Amino acid sequence: PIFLNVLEAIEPGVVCAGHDNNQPDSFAALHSSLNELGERQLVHVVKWAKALPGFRNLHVDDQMAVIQYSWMGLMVFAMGWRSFTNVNSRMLYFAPDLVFNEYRMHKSRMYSQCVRMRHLSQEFGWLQITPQEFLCMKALLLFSIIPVDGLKNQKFFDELRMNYIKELDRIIACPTSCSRRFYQLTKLLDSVQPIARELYQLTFDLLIKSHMVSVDFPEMMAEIISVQVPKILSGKVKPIYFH
Ligand SMILES: C[C@]12CCC(=O)C[C@@H]1CC[C@@H]1[C@@H]2CC[C@]2(C)[C@@H](O)CC[C@@H]12
Incomplete structure (x- = not known):
């Protein structure tokens, strides 16, 4: 099982936000810690991606672009799994030192987005995802997720995406049950993108608001949210849906 051996080996370990849980649950303090997380x-996402089978076949600029467009969905999907296995x-x-209860969902002013993230987390249980x-x-x-005008070497990207779809098929197969499972898992995958889009809109709006009041985001987040996220929000970069 070479492919699954690799994916298991490179999966990132635990990451803490660094949040001081004895300060009060203010909007400012919670988003400070979310942004640091x-x-x-x-x-970790960069080191993980660069170690995936075939990823280094992509042109170097495509490698960075794909990471800089997909990080929100990757991170929300992983957080949903952590939530499913850790607090049900x-x-x-979000992290061992940054667990949101209903009060923190409210004080962060992200309550509706957290509701959707909770729903995604619960799907791992409803579908019994392995x-x-x-x-x-x-x-x-x-x-x-890719630019509508394509990547520098789109043909290698298309072949790589194909092969990761084949691997998902293989895991399911390892025929009427297979077909239903594949439909469920691809419907689950598609449901991540609207959630990530909402969070992309939120974080852009907050970066603008924080800049107005002279509070800076972390360095890499501020660059990606001002250079790459607006390409998503303006429709120059779009998700690839199954359905
Ligand atoms: C990806 C993160 C942080 C990592 C994680 O577990 C998921 C979580 C989803 C909400 C994001 C947050 C990073 C900081 C953001 C982008 C805030 O600016 C607004 C929404 C937050």
Whole structure:
């Protein structure tokens, strides 16, 4: 099982937000820690992506682009899995030191987005997603958003995406049950993109608002949210849907 061996081997370990849980649950303090968590996870997403089978076949500029468009969906999908396995879905397990209860969902001013993230987390239980299915679906999310004008070497991207779809098929197969499962998992994958889109809109709006009041985001987050996220929000970069 070479493919699943690799995915299991490179899966990132635990990452803490660095949140001081004895300060009060203010909008400012919670988003400060969420943004730091994202900056810390970005490091792990890059190292994970560069170690995926075939990823280095992509042109170097495409490698960075695909990471810089897919990170929100990757991170939300992983957080949903952590929540499913750690608190069983009525809380959101962003990190061991940053677990959202209903009060923090409200004070962060992200309550509706957290509701949707809780729903995604609960789908891992409703569908009885296996660790192998989770790992292959998460890898596919890296190959599920691209510029409408294409990548520098789109042909290699298309072949790589094809092969990750084949791997998902293989895990399901390892025929009427297979077909239903594949439909369920591809419907689950598609449901990540609208959630990520909402969070992309939110974080852009907050970066603008924070800049107005002279509070800076972490370095890599501020660059990606001002250079790459607006390409998503303006329609120059679009998700690839199955259905
Ligand atoms: C990806 C993160 C941080 C990592 C994670 O577990 C998922 C979570 C989803 C909400 C994101 C957050 C990073 C910081 C963001 C983007 C805030 O600016 C607004 C929404 C937050």
